[PDB]
Amino acid sequence: SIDPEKLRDQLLDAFENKQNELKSSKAYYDAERRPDAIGLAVPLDMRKYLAHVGYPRTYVDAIAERQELEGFRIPSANGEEPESGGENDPASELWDWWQANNLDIEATLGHTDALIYGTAYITISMPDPEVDFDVDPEVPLIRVEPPTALYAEVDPRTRKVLYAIRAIYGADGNEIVSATLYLPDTTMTWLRAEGEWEAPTSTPHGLEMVPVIPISNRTRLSDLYGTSEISPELRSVTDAAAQILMNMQGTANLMAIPQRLIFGAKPEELGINAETGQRMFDAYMARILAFEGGEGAHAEQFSAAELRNFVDALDALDRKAASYSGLPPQYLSSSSDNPASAEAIKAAESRLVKKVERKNKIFGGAWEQAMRLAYKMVKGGDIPTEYYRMETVWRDPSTPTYAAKADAAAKLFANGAGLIPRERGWVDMGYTIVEREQMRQWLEQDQKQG
Amino acid sequence: SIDPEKLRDQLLDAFENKQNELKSSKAYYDAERRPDAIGLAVPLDMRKYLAHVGYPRTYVDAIAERQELEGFRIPSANGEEPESGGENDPASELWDWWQANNLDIEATLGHTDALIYGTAYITISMPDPEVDFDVDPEVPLIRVEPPTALYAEVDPRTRKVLYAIRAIYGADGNEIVSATLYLPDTTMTWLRAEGEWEAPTSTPHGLEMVPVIPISNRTRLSDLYGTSEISPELRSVTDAAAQILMNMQGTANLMAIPQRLIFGAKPEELGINAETGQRMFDAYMARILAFEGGEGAHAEQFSAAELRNFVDALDALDRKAASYSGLPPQYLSSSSDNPASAEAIKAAESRLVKKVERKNKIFGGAWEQAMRLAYKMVKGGDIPTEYYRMETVWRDPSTPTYAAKADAAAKLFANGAGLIPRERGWVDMGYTIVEREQMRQWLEQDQKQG
Amino acid sequence: TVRANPANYLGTMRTKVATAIAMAFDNAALHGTNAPSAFQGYLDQSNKT
Amino acid sequence: SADHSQIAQTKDTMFTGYLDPVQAKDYFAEAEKTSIVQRVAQKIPMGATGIVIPHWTGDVSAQWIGEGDMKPITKGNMTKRDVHPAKIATIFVASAETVRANPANYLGTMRTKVATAIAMAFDNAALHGTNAPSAFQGYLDQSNKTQSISPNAYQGLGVSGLTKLVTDGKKWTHTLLDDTVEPVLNGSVDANGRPLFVESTYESLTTPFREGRILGRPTILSDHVAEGDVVGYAGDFSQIIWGQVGGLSFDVTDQATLNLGSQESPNFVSLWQHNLVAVRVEAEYGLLINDVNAFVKLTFDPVLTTYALDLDGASAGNFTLSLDGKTSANIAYNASTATVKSAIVAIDDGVSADDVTVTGSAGDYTITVPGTLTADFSGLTDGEGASISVVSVG
């Protein structure tokens, strides 16, 4: 065993150390200045005119805003039993706790911090009415935190969390106002002002387990912590595109125009005022300048830069980014694509739809475990063995091509004479587990009319 | 017989020897800096600007995300349950353990590490309630582990594992924290390897087999140990593309614009400051520079380099990366011929889809044996002979095309007057074995109502 | 010596080094005793006693 | 670095052919010479810190008594020795492209060749004693006993040779012979000219070359037991024990730095800078022979034996020699070489003044004689390490 004061100071160390890693990926999503993005043709006084490129934000958003949870399928013991509901039902209990915490909002944020930084953390507690929560005090208070505010030590031995620290800064002040340590069997919190840590408040819990769970963007089993979704391939083409935008925007300020020259005229033949170095032309349209020179005199010009000669490099980098990322061609390569049929959409969308379907499994494994802790805390007993078997169920991440779904499902059902019992007609139409309980009522209400 | 303390040391040496190889194929999927990727024409400072290429990442993702297990078939002794009764049958018995271990999450990752490094392992154990938690105590604990954390030696004659070692590092400490050695007669683990090396915890087991089995990407019988899917053939084009892309990225800084020259008057006559070698050309757009232009002065420019010379070479290499990998031509962005037809999708997918069906077979052969071991361990007796005839069932890897299958299935079934039994209608429509056995219940509800 | 790790010397050495590194930082900050040129002042440098 | 390097493998001269379609097996390759000592001596479990072996030694005693004779007192005694493992190692190096190519399976071949070279080094350290690190307690060539096989092997092994074992109580339990001894077994004949060790129309190998028993003792054969004039051993192979710590290691690197020179004269090569790959091979062994005199060295001809007798810097007293159990006069410590030769030729029989040889100086006598020489330093007042050993010719 060890004291919590050592653990706090030694974990606030590891936590503050970790921030120097995360800042490297924050700089891509949030499109900050990066040294390697500067365009080297641009002269030193124009290099303040940075050009940012949106590939990292686009690729993270295009995964994140496709996925939402619809329920938990705990199977019935001693034979399967759908349509079981209310106080009888182990699934709608978990959905009540999901809904009462507004996890429909806090999860879809917490997922994108997990895609940006590679991880985020679920936390569970009973509430305490001595804090003015405005939460149902019978419901487990479930929260999600970014790795910029919670850090957890993990066993490589067995992949369970050892202990974890939450830290709260004064927001712009950037100095810690409170910190919380989660031990295997209690949670402790300090607060500080004048730099004095006040005596730790605490709250025991009955679990063997630390009440924190990592969402982790695992790419492989060989990842322990998981990694940013903004891959080193996508970073490299992001910065390559940023340099070419700067070299373009620079060239368009100096060389898009030809430079005009005269040779063999002495400045006194032209009347160039020696104090100031240029006489005023008029240039009001059709005027022919007569002004003189020797027999060796003539006019010359340097050509414009051909700006097309950069643009066909930018087109090539879009065609890189559209492949290194999963994205449909028209998100990045905004060029000549023709997704103009309901089957064609399913083709062009396929590689992104399938990436989100894999991420749904990876995040589902964390949410499943978090709801087991919530039950084990609230109901206090050992987990009913059904809850080891459950899955999270997720929204279909593809475009809702509803007319093509409807004509197909109607042919299968064939007004009840057909191949499919009415319920799989709903699930193929994609109506959510939460909603299909209302269609139980409305179908029953219609059977009284005929 | 064999000294276990010796054999542990000997297998840690054999395990570290494998990492020297794996560090080379990891570097293609993670896109670390590689010696062959540097663009030779780029100057010695600008060689910091690497150009990571994502073909390996793309090609392994597009296989590993299509794969999904959906059940087991165990051909019964002939009777009233030819494949299943719906509960208390071999198919349900294995699928229970698969759910309880979350292998739908873990094995999706396990296939990824198996395609990258060329092999990965399934380790089968009874849970110990003194050591491990959040698992159902009556089911076998199944883990999948990558070759960066486990090594197994094969008797080349019998093609079965002789012994294997799981080696866990202390994360950032770069040292072994624990090691576990699996024998045919027992497992054995030395719980700490940092500070003092602790004494072994043994645990005997009833099997003749050692309780680990390799998944291997074995493409051909002569590959007696598994081989990476990122073939030497695809590695070469990945590195070749990086050179072209980096040579372009240098050219876009130095050479995309013409360099302007004047060959006439001496610097002091051109009004150049002799100390700095410069003058401020006050180049707002319309202005004409005038020169005295002695000795037959002229001005001229070196050309811009045509960046489309490199674009032609990137397009050629994209056509090659598509041809080698067998990805759809759209996944490389290689050509804009988007397959806007229900059947044209089956054509464009055809080689990727078929390749995935072969990876499904080759990994299914290992997942069978893992369940044969798990049953033999849990039930203790020798296995019923139908488990030697087991078959894994995998989800169809083709993109759904739901409405095309829907019209076809309804046309065949014809309200029960048709060609095929209702049950086959569900199989061809592509519902999983769990969806099939669930959907039967709703059909009885509908027929019971009338 | 690494294989045998007598008296856990390779473990104890880490914490004794970490202790020495922490102690050097106090001495550099309080009395400047060996401070690198990058440190701006130390408390013993005050003009008042 | 370079072509041709005498320490590291580039795509050197020797590889040149091994890319053509014209290649074949080596139709004449040798099989590897595995260790013989590891096959006959019992293997002992050993840790890196070595082992302690105890031995009882006290002469516990009892006496006959009459009624009421007050009964005598006795006490036991015991001692121990410890055995520490030594280490043997080597490194070899090739270019990274040579490792990617693996021409003619050179890397694999090298792994087998070092494994074999270490095994032969352990035999040579246990038998001849060629380079034995200080921790090996004795080596088999140190025996003060020899026998000649050539004219008749049965009389050699089973009678003359056995006589000089059992006289000291040392049990004959095995015999180990070199593969080159086969002719003097085939030439072992009776007075009618029939063989001894084979029968009938002479179809089979002789029974020892089937690894059969001789006079109940097993025969062990190998192709590298001969070390000069010595061509085999016979004796109590229970007296030799050995152990290996762990197993044959193979660490690998592309990025360490190697001194190709000496500790006193560096010549560093960075493996990273020259794009080289290197392998580090190591094993650790311990050995103990409890009594070196329990073995007879077997030879063809009736050769003499040569010895060093050391007085350990003793300043006063006398010492004694013995030769096949006959005993010398009592000899003063600082005897002349002529006095020591006189002391040997004064022995009862066979000590002819042309064969017996002495060649050292006062207190440090190199001696050569036809027989088992031994000494007792009782009556020497000084030099507590005063001692006798056989020594190698060169």
mmCIF file of C-alpha atoms in Angstrom, chain B residues 41-310:
data_model
loop_
_atom_site.group_PDB
_atom_site.id
_atom_site.type_symbol
_atom_site.label_atom_id
_atom_site.label_comp_id
_atom_site.label_asym_id
_atom_site.label_seq_id
_atom_site.Cartn_x
_atom_site.Cartn_y
_atom_site.Cartn_z
ATOM 1 C CA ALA B 41 16.980 15.389 -55.694
ATOM 2 C CA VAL B 42 16.040 17.329 -52.484
ATOM 3 C CA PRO B 43 18.948 19.233 -50.732
ATOM 4 C CA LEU B 44 20.411 17.970 -47.442
ATOM 5 C CA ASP B 45 18.369 20.348 -45.210
ATOM 6 C CA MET B 46 15.005 19.976 -47.018
ATOM 7 C CA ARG B 47 15.303 16.160 -46.557
ATOM 8 C CA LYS B 48 13.639 16.809 -43.148
ATOM 9 C CA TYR B 49 10.324 17.205 -45.073
ATOM 10 C CA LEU B 50 9.305 13.534 -45.293
ATOM 11 C CA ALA B 51 6.390 12.401 -47.511
ATOM 12 C CA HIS B 52 4.687 9.375 -45.907
ATOM 13 C CA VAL B 53 2.585 7.254 -48.357
ATOM 14 C CA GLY B 54 -0.560 5.401 -47.198
ATOM 15 C CA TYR B 55 -0.913 2.390 -49.544
ATOM 16 C CA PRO B 56 0.001 -0.220 -46.833
ATOM 17 C CA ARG B 57 -2.382 1.390 -44.304
ATOM 18 C CA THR B 58 -5.133 1.401 -46.932
ATOM 19 C CA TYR B 59 -4.587 -2.153 -48.162
ATOM 20 C CA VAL B 60 -4.575 -3.793 -44.702
ATOM 21 C CA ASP B 61 -7.582 -1.740 -43.483
ATOM 22 C CA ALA B 62 -9.620 -2.631 -46.577
ATOM 23 C CA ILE B 63 -9.128 -6.360 -45.765
ATOM 24 C CA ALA B 64 -9.350 -6.324 -41.951
ATOM 25 C CA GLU B 65 -12.559 -4.232 -41.843
ATOM 26 C CA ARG B 66 -14.472 -6.499 -44.292
ATOM 27 C CA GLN B 67 -13.889 -9.602 -42.106
ATOM 28 C CA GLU B 68 -16.478 -10.511 -39.447
ATOM 29 C CA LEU B 69 -17.350 -13.837 -37.771
ATOM 30 C CA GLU B 70 -21.090 -14.439 -37.209
ATOM 31 C CA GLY B 71 -21.353 -18.019 -35.841
ATOM 32 C CA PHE B 72 -20.270 -21.671 -35.765
ATOM 33 C CA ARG B 73 -21.736 -24.738 -37.529
ATOM 34 C CA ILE B 74 -21.270 -28.162 -35.859
ATOM 35 C CA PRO B 75 -22.931 -30.853 -38.065
ATOM 36 C CA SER B 76 -24.899 -32.925 -35.525
ATOM 37 C CA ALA B 77 -25.397 -36.656 -35.246
ATOM 38 C CA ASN B 78 -28.538 -36.883 -37.384
ATOM 39 C CA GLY B 79 -31.826 -36.092 -35.558
ATOM 40 C CA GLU B 80 -34.405 -33.399 -34.614
ATOM 41 C CA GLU B 81 -31.545 -30.807 -34.317
ATOM 42 C CA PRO B 82 -29.612 -30.999 -37.683
ATOM 43 C CA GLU B 83 -27.706 -27.766 -36.792
ATOM 44 C CA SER B 84 -29.574 -26.196 -33.796
ATOM 45 C CA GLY B 85 -32.617 -26.430 -31.499
ATOM 46 C CA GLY B 86 -32.313 -22.690 -30.511
ATOM 47 C CA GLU B 87 -30.884 -23.195 -26.974
ATOM 48 C CA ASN B 88 -28.642 -25.900 -25.345
ATOM 49 C CA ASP B 89 -26.844 -26.884 -28.611
ATOM 50 C CA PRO B 90 -23.125 -26.774 -29.654
ATOM 51 C CA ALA B 91 -23.601 -23.695 -31.875
ATOM 52 C CA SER B 92 -25.091 -21.693 -28.956
ATOM 53 C CA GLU B 93 -22.480 -23.130 -26.563
ATOM 54 C CA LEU B 94 -19.526 -21.665 -28.505
ATOM 55 C CA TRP B 95 -21.274 -18.408 -29.380
ATOM 56 C CA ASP B 96 -21.881 -17.788 -25.646
ATOM 57 C CA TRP B 97 -18.091 -17.881 -24.993
ATOM 58 C CA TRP B 98 -17.365 -15.707 -28.053
ATOM 59 C CA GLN B 99 -19.783 -13.045 -26.757
ATOM 60 C CA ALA B 100 -18.607 -13.272 -23.112
ATOM 61 C CA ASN B 101 -14.944 -12.669 -24.112
ATOM 62 C CA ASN B 102 -15.869 -9.768 -26.494
ATOM 63 C CA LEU B 103 -13.928 -11.517 -29.287
ATOM 64 C CA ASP B 104 -16.001 -9.531 -31.825
ATOM 65 C CA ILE B 105 -13.980 -6.517 -30.568
ATOM 66 C CA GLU B 106 -10.637 -8.258 -29.951
ATOM 67 C CA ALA B 107 -10.425 -10.583 -32.982
ATOM 68 C CA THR B 108 -11.221 -7.657 -35.351
ATOM 69 C CA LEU B 109 -7.949 -6.180 -34.060
ATOM 70 C CA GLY B 110 -6.230 -9.624 -34.025
ATOM 71 C CA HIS B 111 -6.754 -9.992 -37.785
ATOM 72 C CA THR B 112 -5.142 -6.539 -38.256
ATOM 73 C CA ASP B 113 -1.956 -7.494 -36.367
ATOM 74 C CA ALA B 114 -1.990 -10.875 -38.176
ATOM 75 C CA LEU B 115 -2.050 -9.144 -41.606
ATOM 76 C CA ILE B 116 0.637 -6.571 -40.628
ATOM 77 C CA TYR B 117 3.221 -8.788 -38.867
ATOM 78 C CA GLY B 118 2.087 -12.018 -40.654
ATOM 79 C CA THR B 119 0.843 -13.939 -37.559
ATOM 80 C CA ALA B 120 -0.885 -13.529 -34.141
ATOM 81 C CA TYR B 121 -1.888 -16.018 -31.402
ATOM 82 C CA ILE B 122 -4.964 -17.219 -29.488
ATOM 83 C CA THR B 123 -4.207 -18.156 -25.831
ATOM 84 C CA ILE B 124 -6.868 -20.191 -23.977
ATOM 85 C CA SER B 125 -7.129 -20.273 -20.133
ATOM 86 C CA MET B 126 -9.485 -20.868 -17.223
ATOM 87 C CA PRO B 127 -10.098 -17.536 -15.400
ATOM 88 C CA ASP B 128 -8.597 -17.214 -11.890
ATOM 89 C CA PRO B 129 -10.907 -15.253 -9.505
ATOM 90 C CA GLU B 130 -7.850 -14.444 -7.315
ATOM 91 C CA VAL B 131 -6.253 -12.550 -10.307
ATOM 92 C CA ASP B 132 -8.816 -11.535 -13.005
ATOM 93 C CA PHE B 133 -12.180 -9.714 -12.878
ATOM 94 C CA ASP B 134 -15.165 -8.553 -15.014
ATOM 95 C CA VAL B 135 -15.441 -12.018 -16.712
ATOM 96 C CA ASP B 136 -18.011 -14.827 -16.247
ATOM 97 C CA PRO B 137 -16.211 -17.374 -13.947
ATOM 98 C CA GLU B 138 -17.700 -20.481 -15.687
ATOM 99 C CA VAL B 139 -16.564 -19.592 -19.302
ATOM 100 C CA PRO B 140 -12.981 -20.093 -20.574
ATOM 101 C CA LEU B 141 -10.947 -16.866 -20.748
ATOM 102 C CA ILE B 142 -9.776 -16.439 -24.369
ATOM 103 C CA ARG B 143 -7.188 -13.764 -25.290
ATOM 104 C CA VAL B 144 -5.670 -12.848 -28.657
ATOM 105 C CA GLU B 145 -2.043 -11.612 -28.488
ATOM 106 C CA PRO B 146 0.252 -10.116 -31.190
ATOM 107 C CA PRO B 147 3.793 -11.363 -32.007
ATOM 108 C CA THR B 148 5.221 -8.139 -30.492
ATOM 109 C CA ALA B 149 4.200 -9.681 -27.104
ATOM 110 C CA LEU B 150 4.279 -13.497 -27.679
ATOM 111 C CA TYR B 151 6.364 -16.119 -29.512
ATOM 112 C CA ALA B 152 5.629 -19.812 -30.213
ATOM 113 C CA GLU B 153 7.924 -22.517 -31.624
ATOM 114 C CA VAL B 154 6.419 -25.142 -33.961
ATOM 115 C CA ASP B 155 7.499 -28.764 -34.370
ATOM 116 C CA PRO B 156 8.054 -28.517 -38.150
ATOM 117 C CA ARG B 157 7.100 -32.224 -38.638
ATOM 118 C CA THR B 158 3.698 -32.314 -36.853
ATOM 119 C CA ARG B 159 3.019 -28.583 -37.587
ATOM 120 C CA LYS B 160 1.935 -28.076 -33.929
ATOM 121 C CA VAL B 161 3.307 -25.719 -31.217
ATOM 122 C CA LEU B 162 6.008 -27.184 -28.890
ATOM 123 C CA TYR B 163 6.096 -24.291 -26.363
ATOM 124 C CA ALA B 164 5.521 -20.516 -26.300
ATOM 125 C CA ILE B 165 6.302 -17.442 -24.170
ATOM 126 C CA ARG B 166 4.207 -14.309 -23.500
ATOM 127 C CA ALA B 167 6.571 -11.430 -22.706
ATOM 128 C CA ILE B 168 5.134 -8.208 -21.265
ATOM 129 C CA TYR B 169 7.215 -5.004 -21.216
ATOM 130 C CA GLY B 170 7.005 -2.297 -18.486
ATOM 131 C CA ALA B 171 5.718 0.133 -21.187
ATOM 132 C CA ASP B 172 8.138 3.131 -21.394
ATOM 133 C CA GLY B 173 10.644 1.252 -19.119
ATOM 134 C CA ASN B 174 11.761 -0.870 -22.171
ATOM 135 C CA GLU B 175 12.255 -3.957 -19.906
ATOM 136 C CA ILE B 176 10.330 -7.225 -19.326
ATOM 137 C CA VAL B 177 7.910 -6.728 -16.374
ATOM 138 C CA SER B 178 6.517 -10.309 -16.509
ATOM 139 C CA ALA B 179 6.830 -13.492 -18.579
ATOM 140 C CA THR B 180 4.604 -16.577 -18.941
ATOM 141 C CA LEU B 181 5.735 -19.885 -20.494
ATOM 142 C CA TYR B 182 3.162 -22.324 -21.920
ATOM 143 C CA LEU B 183 4.016 -26.056 -21.980
ATOM 144 C CA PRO B 184 1.945 -29.069 -23.108
ATOM 145 C CA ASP B 185 1.690 -30.178 -19.423
ATOM 146 C CA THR B 186 1.222 -26.765 -17.695
ATOM 147 C CA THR B 187 1.331 -22.982 -17.863
ATOM 148 C CA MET B 188 3.887 -21.194 -15.651
ATOM 149 C CA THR B 189 4.454 -17.476 -14.926
ATOM 150 C CA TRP B 190 7.176 -15.424 -13.182
ATOM 151 C CA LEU B 191 4.986 -12.590 -11.915
ATOM 152 C CA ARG B 192 7.750 -9.912 -11.719
ATOM 153 C CA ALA B 193 10.924 -9.482 -13.809
ATOM 154 C CA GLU B 194 11.830 -5.917 -12.618
ATOM 155 C CA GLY B 195 13.786 -5.429 -9.418
ATOM 156 C CA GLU B 196 14.246 -9.073 -8.305
ATOM 157 C CA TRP B 197 13.059 -11.845 -10.695
ATOM 158 C CA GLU B 198 10.240 -13.527 -8.662
ATOM 159 C CA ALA B 199 9.593 -17.317 -8.260
ATOM 160 C CA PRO B 200 7.172 -19.076 -10.698
ATOM 161 C CA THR B 201 3.433 -19.544 -10.240
ATOM 162 C CA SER B 202 2.709 -22.854 -12.030
ATOM 163 C CA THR B 203 -0.794 -23.986 -13.133
ATOM 164 C CA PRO B 204 -1.341 -27.527 -14.550
ATOM 165 C CA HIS B 205 -3.892 -28.316 -17.279
ATOM 166 C CA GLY B 206 -5.398 -31.592 -18.569
ATOM 167 C CA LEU B 207 -4.653 -31.122 -22.294
ATOM 168 C CA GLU B 208 -2.012 -32.916 -24.391
ATOM 169 C CA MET B 209 -1.774 -29.713 -26.491
ATOM 170 C CA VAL B 210 -0.044 -26.488 -25.410
ATOM 171 C CA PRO B 211 -2.895 -23.914 -24.898
ATOM 172 C CA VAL B 212 -1.893 -21.438 -27.645
ATOM 173 C CA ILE B 213 -2.682 -21.554 -31.390
ATOM 174 C CA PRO B 214 -1.342 -19.257 -34.163
ATOM 175 C CA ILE B 215 -3.468 -17.366 -36.629
ATOM 176 C CA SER B 216 -1.164 -17.125 -39.685
ATOM 177 C CA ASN B 217 -1.458 -15.200 -42.965
ATOM 178 C CA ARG B 218 -0.040 -18.347 -44.688
ATOM 179 C CA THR B 219 -0.659 -17.768 -48.439
ATOM 180 C CA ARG B 220 1.040 -20.974 -49.695
ATOM 181 C CA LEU B 221 2.112 -24.301 -48.095
ATOM 182 C CA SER B 222 5.862 -23.490 -48.409
ATOM 183 C CA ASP B 223 5.357 -20.524 -45.960
ATOM 184 C CA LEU B 224 5.798 -22.797 -42.887
ATOM 185 C CA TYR B 225 5.621 -19.728 -40.572
ATOM 186 C CA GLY B 226 3.248 -16.823 -41.421
ATOM 187 C CA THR B 227 4.183 -13.887 -43.750
ATOM 188 C CA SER B 228 3.161 -10.181 -43.827
ATOM 189 C CA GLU B 229 0.354 -9.133 -46.193
ATOM 190 C CA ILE B 230 2.262 -5.901 -47.034
ATOM 191 C CA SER B 231 4.123 -7.769 -49.801
ATOM 192 C CA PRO B 232 7.637 -6.793 -51.070
ATOM 193 C CA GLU B 233 5.763 -6.038 -54.298
ATOM 194 C CA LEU B 234 3.592 -3.359 -52.581
ATOM 195 C CA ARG B 235 6.470 -2.048 -50.380
ATOM 196 C CA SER B 236 8.480 -1.143 -53.498
ATOM 197 C CA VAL B 237 5.648 1.012 -54.968
ATOM 198 C CA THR B 238 4.984 2.620 -51.561
ATOM 199 C CA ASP B 239 8.631 3.758 -51.354
ATOM 200 C CA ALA B 240 8.838 4.680 -55.066
ATOM 201 C CA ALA B 241 5.775 6.940 -54.697
ATOM 202 C CA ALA B 242 7.334 8.676 -51.650
ATOM 203 C CA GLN B 243 10.448 9.610 -53.674
ATOM 204 C CA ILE B 244 8.342 11.131 -56.520
ATOM 205 C CA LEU B 245 6.134 12.957 -54.004
ATOM 206 C CA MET B 246 9.139 14.358 -52.111
ATOM 207 C CA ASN B 247 10.979 15.416 -55.318
ATOM 208 C CA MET B 248 7.788 17.285 -56.305
ATOM 209 C CA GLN B 249 7.598 18.853 -52.823
ATOM 210 C CA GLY B 250 11.174 20.179 -53.165
ATOM 211 C CA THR B 251 10.493 21.397 -56.730
ATOM 212 C CA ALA B 252 7.388 23.294 -55.530
ATOM 213 C CA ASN B 253 9.664 25.405 -53.243
ATOM 214 C CA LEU B 254 12.754 26.061 -55.459
ATOM 215 C CA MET B 255 11.660 25.605 -59.074
ATOM 216 C CA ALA B 256 7.920 26.147 -59.740
ATOM 217 C CA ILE B 257 8.665 29.806 -60.774
ATOM 218 C CA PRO B 258 11.107 31.228 -63.361
ATOM 219 C CA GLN B 259 14.396 32.774 -62.132
ATOM 220 C CA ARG B 260 14.964 36.247 -63.636
ATOM 221 C CA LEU B 261 18.441 37.520 -64.712
ATOM 222 C CA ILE B 262 20.067 40.708 -66.137
ATOM 223 C CA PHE B 263 23.421 40.486 -68.015
ATOM 224 C CA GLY B 264 24.084 44.193 -68.775
ATOM 225 C CA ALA B 265 25.503 46.853 -66.469
ATOM 226 C CA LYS B 266 27.821 46.390 -63.438
ATOM 227 C CA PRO B 267 26.148 46.347 -59.951
ATOM 228 C CA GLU B 268 27.262 49.920 -59.048
ATOM 229 C CA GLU B 269 25.807 51.218 -62.369
ATOM 230 C CA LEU B 270 22.592 49.235 -61.612
ATOM 231 C CA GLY B 271 22.556 51.214 -58.298
ATOM 232 C CA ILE B 272 23.072 48.054 -56.169
ATOM 233 C CA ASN B 273 24.394 48.725 -52.635
ATOM 234 C CA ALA B 274 27.937 47.261 -52.762
ATOM 235 C CA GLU B 275 28.091 46.100 -49.087
ATOM 236 C CA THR B 276 24.831 44.059 -49.075
ATOM 237 C CA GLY B 277 24.611 43.201 -52.825
ATOM 238 C CA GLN B 278 20.922 44.347 -52.948
ATOM 239 C CA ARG B 279 18.470 47.148 -53.879
ATOM 240 C CA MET B 280 14.753 47.562 -53.054
ATOM 241 C CA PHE B 281 12.995 47.128 -56.415
ATOM 242 C CA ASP B 282 9.748 48.980 -55.472
ATOM 243 C CA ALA B 283 7.610 46.562 -57.481
ATOM 244 C CA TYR B 284 3.961 47.699 -57.386
ATOM 245 C CA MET B 285 2.345 46.145 -60.412
ATOM 246 C CA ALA B 286 2.390 48.537 -63.434
ATOM 247 C CA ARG B 287 5.862 50.142 -62.988
ATOM 248 C CA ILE B 288 8.555 50.063 -65.699
ATOM 249 C CA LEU B 289 12.216 49.611 -64.679
ATOM 250 C CA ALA B 290 14.630 51.695 -66.812
ATOM 251 C CA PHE B 291 18.366 50.996 -67.297
ATOM 252 C CA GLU B 292 21.256 52.831 -68.969
ATOM 253 C CA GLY B 293 21.984 49.369 -70.427
ATOM 254 C CA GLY B 294 25.676 49.711 -71.440
ATOM 255 C CA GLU B 295 27.640 47.295 -73.713
ATOM 256 C CA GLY B 296 24.499 45.799 -75.361
ATOM 257 C CA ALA B 297 22.644 44.811 -72.144
ATOM 258 C CA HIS B 298 19.865 42.169 -72.091
ATOM 259 C CA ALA B 299 17.582 40.416 -69.598
ATOM 260 C CA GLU B 300 16.479 36.744 -69.586
ATOM 261 C CA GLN B 301 15.065 34.010 -67.303
ATOM 262 C CA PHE B 302 15.507 30.329 -66.534
ATOM 263 C CA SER B 303 12.184 28.482 -66.995
ATOM 264 C CA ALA B 304 9.890 27.231 -64.298
ATOM 265 C CA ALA B 305 10.008 23.430 -63.978
ATOM 266 C CA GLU B 306 6.708 21.849 -65.191
ATOM 267 C CA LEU B 307 5.292 20.206 -62.007
ATOM 268 C CA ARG B 308 2.956 18.068 -64.167
ATOM 269 C CA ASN B 309 6.047 16.003 -65.142
ATOM 270 C CA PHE B 310 5.869 14.577 -61.602
#
